[PDB]
Short mmCIF file of C-alpha atoms and ligand atoms in Angstrom, two decimals:
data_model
loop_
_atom_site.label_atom_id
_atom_site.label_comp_id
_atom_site.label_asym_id
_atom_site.label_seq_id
_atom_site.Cartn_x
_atom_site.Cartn_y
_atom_site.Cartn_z
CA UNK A 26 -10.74 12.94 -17.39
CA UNK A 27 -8.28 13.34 -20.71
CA UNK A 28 -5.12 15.34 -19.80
CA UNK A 29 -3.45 16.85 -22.85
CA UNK A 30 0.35 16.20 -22.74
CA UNK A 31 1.79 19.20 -23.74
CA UNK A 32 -0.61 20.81 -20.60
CA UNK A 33 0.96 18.43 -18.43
CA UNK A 34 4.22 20.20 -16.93
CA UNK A 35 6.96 17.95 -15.39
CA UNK A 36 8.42 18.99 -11.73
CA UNK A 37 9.86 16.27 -10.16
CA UNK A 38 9.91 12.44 -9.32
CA UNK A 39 7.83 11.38 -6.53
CA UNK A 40 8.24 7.50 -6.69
CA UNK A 41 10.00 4.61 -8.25
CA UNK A 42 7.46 1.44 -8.83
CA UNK A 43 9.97 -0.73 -10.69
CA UNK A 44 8.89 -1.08 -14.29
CA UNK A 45 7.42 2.56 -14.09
CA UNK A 46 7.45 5.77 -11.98
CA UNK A 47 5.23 8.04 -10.31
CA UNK A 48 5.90 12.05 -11.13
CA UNK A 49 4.48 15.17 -9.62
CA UNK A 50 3.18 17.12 -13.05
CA UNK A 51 1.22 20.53 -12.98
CA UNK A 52 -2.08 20.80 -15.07
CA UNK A 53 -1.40 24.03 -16.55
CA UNK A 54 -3.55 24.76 -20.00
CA UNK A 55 -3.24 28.20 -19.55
CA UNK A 56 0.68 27.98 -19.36
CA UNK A 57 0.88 30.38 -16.69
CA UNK A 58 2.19 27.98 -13.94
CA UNK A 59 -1.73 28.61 -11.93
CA UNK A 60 -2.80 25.15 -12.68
CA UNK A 61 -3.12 22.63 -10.49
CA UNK A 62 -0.81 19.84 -9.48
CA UNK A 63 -1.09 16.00 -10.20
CA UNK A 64 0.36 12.59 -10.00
CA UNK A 65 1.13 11.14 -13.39
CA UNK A 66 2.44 7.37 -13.59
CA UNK A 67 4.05 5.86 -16.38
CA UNK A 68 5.55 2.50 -17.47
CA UNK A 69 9.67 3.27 -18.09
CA UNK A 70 10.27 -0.71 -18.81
CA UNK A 71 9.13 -2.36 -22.04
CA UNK A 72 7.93 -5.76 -22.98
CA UNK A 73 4.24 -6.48 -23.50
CA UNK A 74 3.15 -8.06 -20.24
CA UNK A 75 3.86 -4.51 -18.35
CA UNK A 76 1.62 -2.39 -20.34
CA UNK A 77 -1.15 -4.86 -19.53
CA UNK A 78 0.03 -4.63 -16.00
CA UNK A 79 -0.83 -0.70 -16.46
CA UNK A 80 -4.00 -1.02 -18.75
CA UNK A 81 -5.13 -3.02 -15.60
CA UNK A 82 -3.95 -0.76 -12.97
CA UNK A 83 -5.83 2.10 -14.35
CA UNK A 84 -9.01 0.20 -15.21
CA UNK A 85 -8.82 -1.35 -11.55
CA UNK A 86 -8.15 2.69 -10.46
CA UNK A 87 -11.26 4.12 -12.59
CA UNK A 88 -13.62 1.55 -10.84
CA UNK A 89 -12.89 2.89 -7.03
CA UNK A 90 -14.54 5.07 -5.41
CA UNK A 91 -13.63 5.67 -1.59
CA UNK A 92 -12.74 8.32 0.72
CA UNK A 93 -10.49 5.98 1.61
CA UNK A 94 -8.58 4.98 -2.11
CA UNK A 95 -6.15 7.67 -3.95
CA UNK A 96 -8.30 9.22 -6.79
CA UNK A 97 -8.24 8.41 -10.33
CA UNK A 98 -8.70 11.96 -12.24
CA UNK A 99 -8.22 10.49 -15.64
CA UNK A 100 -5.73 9.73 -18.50
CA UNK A 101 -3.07 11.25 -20.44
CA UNK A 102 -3.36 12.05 -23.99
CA UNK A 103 -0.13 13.30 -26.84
CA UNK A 104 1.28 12.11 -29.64
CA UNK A 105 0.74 8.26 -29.04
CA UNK A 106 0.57 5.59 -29.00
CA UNK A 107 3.76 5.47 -26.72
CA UNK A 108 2.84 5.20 -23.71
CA UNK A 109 -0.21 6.56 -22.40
CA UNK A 110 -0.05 7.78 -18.74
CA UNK A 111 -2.57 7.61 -15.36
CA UNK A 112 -3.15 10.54 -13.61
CA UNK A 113 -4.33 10.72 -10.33
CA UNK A 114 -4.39 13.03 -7.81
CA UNK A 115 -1.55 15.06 -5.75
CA UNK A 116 -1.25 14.64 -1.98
CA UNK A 117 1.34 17.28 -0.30
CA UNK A 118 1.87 15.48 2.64
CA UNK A 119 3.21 12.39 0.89
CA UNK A 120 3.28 9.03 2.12
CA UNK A 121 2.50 7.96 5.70
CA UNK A 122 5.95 6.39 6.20
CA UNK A 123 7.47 9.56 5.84
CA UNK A 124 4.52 11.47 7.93
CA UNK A 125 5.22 9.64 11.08
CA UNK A 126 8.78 10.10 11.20
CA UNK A 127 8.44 13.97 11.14
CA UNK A 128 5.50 14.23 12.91
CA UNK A 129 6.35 11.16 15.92
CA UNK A 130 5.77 13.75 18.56
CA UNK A 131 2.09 15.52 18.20
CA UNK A 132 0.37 11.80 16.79
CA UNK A 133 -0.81 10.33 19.79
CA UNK A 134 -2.31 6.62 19.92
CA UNK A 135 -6.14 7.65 19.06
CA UNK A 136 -4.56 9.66 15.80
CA UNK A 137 -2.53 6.07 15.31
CA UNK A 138 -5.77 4.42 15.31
CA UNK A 139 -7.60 6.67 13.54
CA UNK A 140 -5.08 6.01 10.35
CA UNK A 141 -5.60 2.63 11.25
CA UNK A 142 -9.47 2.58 11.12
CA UNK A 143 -9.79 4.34 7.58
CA UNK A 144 -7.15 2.11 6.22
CA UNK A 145 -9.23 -0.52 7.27
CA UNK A 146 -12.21 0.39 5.61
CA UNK A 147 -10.35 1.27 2.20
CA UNK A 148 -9.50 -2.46 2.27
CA UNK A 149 -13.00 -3.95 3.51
CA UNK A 150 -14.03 -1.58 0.22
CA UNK A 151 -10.80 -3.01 -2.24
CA UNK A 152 -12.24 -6.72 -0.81
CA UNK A 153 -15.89 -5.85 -1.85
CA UNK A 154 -14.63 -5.06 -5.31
CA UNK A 155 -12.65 -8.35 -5.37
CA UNK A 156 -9.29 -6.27 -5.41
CA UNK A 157 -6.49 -7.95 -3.81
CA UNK A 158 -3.64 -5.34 -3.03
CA UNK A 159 -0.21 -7.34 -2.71
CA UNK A 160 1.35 -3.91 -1.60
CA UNK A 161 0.17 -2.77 1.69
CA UNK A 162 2.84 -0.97 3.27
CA UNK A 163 3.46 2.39 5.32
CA UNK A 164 5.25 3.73 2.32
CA UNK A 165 2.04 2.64 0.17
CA UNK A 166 -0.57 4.77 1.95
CA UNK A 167 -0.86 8.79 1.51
CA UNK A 168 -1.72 11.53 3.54
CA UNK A 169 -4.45 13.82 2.67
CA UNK A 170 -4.49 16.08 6.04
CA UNK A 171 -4.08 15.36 9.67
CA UNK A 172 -7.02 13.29 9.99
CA UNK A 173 -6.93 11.51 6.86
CA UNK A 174 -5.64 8.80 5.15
CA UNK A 175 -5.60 6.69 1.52
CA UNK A 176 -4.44 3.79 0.05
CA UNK A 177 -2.42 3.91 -3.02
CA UNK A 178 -0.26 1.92 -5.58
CA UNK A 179 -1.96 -0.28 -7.33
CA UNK A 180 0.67 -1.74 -9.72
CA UNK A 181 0.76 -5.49 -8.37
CA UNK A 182 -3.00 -5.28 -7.54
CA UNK A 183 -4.90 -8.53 -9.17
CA UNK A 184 -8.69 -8.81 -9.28
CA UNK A 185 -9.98 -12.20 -7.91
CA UNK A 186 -12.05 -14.13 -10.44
CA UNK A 187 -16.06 -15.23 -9.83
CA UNK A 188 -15.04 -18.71 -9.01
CA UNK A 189 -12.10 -17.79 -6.72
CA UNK A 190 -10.72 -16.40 -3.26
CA UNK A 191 -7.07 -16.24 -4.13
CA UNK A 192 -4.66 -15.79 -6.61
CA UNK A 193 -1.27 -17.53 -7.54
CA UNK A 194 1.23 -14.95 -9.10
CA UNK A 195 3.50 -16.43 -11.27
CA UNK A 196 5.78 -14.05 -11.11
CA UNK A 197 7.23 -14.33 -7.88
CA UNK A 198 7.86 -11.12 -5.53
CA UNK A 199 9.78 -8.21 -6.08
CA UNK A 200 8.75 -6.08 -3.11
CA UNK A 201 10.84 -6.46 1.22
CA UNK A 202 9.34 -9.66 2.38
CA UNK A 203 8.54 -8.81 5.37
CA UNK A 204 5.37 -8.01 4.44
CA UNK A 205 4.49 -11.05 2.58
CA UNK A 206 2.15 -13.42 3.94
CA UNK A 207 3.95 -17.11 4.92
CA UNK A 208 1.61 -18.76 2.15
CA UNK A 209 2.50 -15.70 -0.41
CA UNK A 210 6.29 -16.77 0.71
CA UNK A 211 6.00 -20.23 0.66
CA UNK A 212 3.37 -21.04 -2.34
CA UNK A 213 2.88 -17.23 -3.85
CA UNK A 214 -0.84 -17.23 -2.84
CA UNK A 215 -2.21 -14.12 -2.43
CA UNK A 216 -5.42 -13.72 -1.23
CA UNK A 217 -7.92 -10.45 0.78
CA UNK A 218 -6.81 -12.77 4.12
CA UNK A 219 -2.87 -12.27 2.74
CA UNK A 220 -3.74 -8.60 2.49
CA UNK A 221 -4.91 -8.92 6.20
CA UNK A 222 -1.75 -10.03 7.56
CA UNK A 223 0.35 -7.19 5.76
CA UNK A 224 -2.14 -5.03 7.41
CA UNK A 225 -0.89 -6.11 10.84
CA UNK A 226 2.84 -5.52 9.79
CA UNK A 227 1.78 -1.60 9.10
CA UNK A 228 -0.08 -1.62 12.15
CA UNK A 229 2.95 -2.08 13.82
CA UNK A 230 4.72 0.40 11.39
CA UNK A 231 1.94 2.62 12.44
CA UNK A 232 2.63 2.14 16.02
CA UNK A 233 6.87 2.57 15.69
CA UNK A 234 5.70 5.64 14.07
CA UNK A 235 7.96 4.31 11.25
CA UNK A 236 11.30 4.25 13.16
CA UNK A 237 14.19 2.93 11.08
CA UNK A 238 16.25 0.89 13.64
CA UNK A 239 13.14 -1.46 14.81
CA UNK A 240 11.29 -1.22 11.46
CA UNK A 241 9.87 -4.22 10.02
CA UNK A 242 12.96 -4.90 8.40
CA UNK A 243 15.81 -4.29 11.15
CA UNK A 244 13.48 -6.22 13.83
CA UNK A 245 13.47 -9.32 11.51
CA UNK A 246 16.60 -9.39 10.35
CA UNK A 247 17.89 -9.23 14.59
CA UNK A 248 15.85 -12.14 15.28
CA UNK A 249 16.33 -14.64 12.03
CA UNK A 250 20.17 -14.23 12.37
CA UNK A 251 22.99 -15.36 10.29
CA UNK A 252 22.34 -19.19 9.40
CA UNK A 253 25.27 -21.04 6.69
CA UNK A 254 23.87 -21.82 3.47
CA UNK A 255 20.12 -21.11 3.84
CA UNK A 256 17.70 -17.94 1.86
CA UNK A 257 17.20 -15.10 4.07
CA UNK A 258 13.23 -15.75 2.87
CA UNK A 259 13.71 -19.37 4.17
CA UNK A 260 15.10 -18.67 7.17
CA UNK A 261 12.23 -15.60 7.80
CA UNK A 262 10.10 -18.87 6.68
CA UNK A 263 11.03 -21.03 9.35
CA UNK A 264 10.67 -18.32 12.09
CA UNK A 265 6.78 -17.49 11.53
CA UNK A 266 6.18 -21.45 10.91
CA UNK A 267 7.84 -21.74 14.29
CA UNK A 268 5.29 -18.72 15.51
CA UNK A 269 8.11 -16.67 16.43
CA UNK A 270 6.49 -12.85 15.69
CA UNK A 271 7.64 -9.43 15.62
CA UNK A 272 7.55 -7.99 18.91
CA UNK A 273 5.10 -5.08 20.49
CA UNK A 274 6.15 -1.78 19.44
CA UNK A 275 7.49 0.65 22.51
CA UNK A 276 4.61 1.58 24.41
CA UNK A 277 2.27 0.34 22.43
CA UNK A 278 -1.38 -0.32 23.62
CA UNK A 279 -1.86 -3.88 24.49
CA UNK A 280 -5.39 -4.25 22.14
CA UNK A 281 -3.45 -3.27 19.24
CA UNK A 282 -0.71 -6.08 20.21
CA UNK A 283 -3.26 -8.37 20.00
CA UNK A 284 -5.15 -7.40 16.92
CA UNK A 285 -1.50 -7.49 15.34
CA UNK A 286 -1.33 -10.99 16.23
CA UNK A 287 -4.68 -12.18 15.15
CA UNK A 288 -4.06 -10.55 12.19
CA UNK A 289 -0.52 -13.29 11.48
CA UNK A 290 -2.86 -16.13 12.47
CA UNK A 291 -0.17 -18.71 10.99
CA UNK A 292 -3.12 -20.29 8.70
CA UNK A 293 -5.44 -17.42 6.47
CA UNK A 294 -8.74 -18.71 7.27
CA UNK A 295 -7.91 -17.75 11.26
CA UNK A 296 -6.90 -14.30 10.22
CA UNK A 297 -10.21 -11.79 11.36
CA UNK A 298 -11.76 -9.87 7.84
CA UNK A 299 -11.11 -6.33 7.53
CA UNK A 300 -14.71 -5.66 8.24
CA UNK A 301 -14.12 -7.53 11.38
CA UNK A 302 -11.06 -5.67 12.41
CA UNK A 303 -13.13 -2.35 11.72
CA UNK A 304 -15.15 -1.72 14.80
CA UNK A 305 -12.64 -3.53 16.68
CA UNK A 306 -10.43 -0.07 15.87
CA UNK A 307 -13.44 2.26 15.89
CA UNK A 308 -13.74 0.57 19.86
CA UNK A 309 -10.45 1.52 20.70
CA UNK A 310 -10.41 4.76 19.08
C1 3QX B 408 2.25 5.93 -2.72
C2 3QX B 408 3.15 6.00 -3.96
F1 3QX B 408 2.45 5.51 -5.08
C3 3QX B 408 4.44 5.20 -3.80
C4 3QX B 408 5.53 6.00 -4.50
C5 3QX B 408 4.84 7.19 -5.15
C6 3QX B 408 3.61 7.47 -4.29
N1 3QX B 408 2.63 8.21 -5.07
C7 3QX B 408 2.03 9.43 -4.79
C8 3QX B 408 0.74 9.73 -5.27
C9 3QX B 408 -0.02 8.73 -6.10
N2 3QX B 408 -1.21 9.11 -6.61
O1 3QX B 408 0.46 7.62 -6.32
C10 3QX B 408 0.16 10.97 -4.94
N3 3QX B 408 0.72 11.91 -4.15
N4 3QX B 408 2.00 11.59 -3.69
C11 3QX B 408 2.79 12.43 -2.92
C12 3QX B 408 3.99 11.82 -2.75
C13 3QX B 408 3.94 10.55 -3.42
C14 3QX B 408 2.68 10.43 -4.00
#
């Protein structure tokens, strides 16, 4: 729950979360390279808005507790106070994005939708606790074993006040927008129903088992084209206004079309709740 520094041996970099990265550390008190592995992240950037950003992060982190939700194992202390570092624990597999791209041919549809139902319930539990992700992606989500998945990153996730079902970021966005919600694009509201409709765009990244060349991404950028003087964002902006949609995945099941679709209902009080989408999956498998 309080990790020494000088026990915490550096191997390599696992992510890069602008503003501060994610490296894969081994525990080792006894110094004999036997002690386990980790995932230690720390702010690189500086300017006192960030390290609140991380004091929140690992307070938001420390109050989850799901099968479902990467675990918190504690912090980091050395000679401070610079910069104080979350540690969490190591998954070998890695992320999901990268899963399903070596793995395309022994995950069938039921293992699809498997992934699918326990990512569902880590958000129905990240809603309960008023926790609004703003980063659910493919890339986002780790692998624990075969049948098993968890939600990670937590570096733009805001808590939603008493009085309040969304939040404006002030910001704006720094992360592929085409994962955004249209009112997160438009207005920068994010909300548990914005979290819903990123939701659908990894259950089609779920269902392209990740495949570069029709990837969220690539499919968009086909089908919003090359206008004269107009924002790539605005353009994406007039398309979903317009209801135009990414398209079904290659041979995927026709349910999960569907649930993709009512999950970018074009206004957020149409879009179903994640405990509402969660039998829905169990039903199909
Ligand atoms: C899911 C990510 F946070 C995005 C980039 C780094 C990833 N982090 C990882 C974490 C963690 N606790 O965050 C844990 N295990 N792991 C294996 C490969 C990558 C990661």
């Amino acid at each position: 729950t309080i990790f020494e520094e000088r026990h915490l041996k550096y191997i390599s970099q696992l992510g890069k979360g602008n503003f501060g990265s994610v490296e894969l550390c081994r525990y080792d008190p006894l110094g004999d390279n036997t002690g386990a592995l980790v995932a230690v992240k720390q702010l690189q950037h500086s300017g006192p808005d960030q390290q609140r950003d991380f004091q929140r992060e690992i307070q938001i982190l420390k109050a989850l507790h799901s099968d479902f939700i990467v675990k918190y194992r504690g912090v980091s202390y050395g000679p401070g106070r610079q910069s104080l570092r979350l540690v969490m624990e190591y998954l070998p597999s890695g992320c999901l994005r990268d899963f399903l791209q070596r793995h395309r041919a022994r995950l069938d549809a039921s293992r699809l939708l498997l992934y699918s139902s326990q990512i569902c319930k880590g958000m129905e539990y990240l809603g309960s606790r008023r926790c609004v992700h703003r980063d659910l992606a493919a890339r986002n989500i780790l692998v624990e074993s075969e049948a098993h998945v968890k939600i990670a990153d937590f570096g733009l996730a805001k808590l939603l006040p008493l009085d309040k079902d969304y939040y404006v970021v002030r910001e704006p966005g720094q992360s592929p927008i085409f994962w955004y919600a249209p009112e997160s694009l438009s207005d920068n509201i994010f909300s548990r129903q914005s979290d819903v409709w990123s939701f659908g765009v990894v259950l089609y990244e779920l269902f392209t088992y990740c495949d570069k060349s029709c990837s969220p991404s690539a499919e968009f950028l086909r089908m919003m084209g090359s206008e004269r003087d107009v924002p790539a964002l605005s353009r994406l902006l007039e398309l979903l206004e317009e209801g135009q949609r990414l398209p079904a995945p290659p041979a995927c099941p026709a349910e999960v079309h569907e649930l993709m679709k009512l999950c970018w209902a074009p206004s957020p009080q149409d879009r179903p709740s994640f405990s509402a989408l969660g039998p829905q999956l169990d039903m199909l498998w």
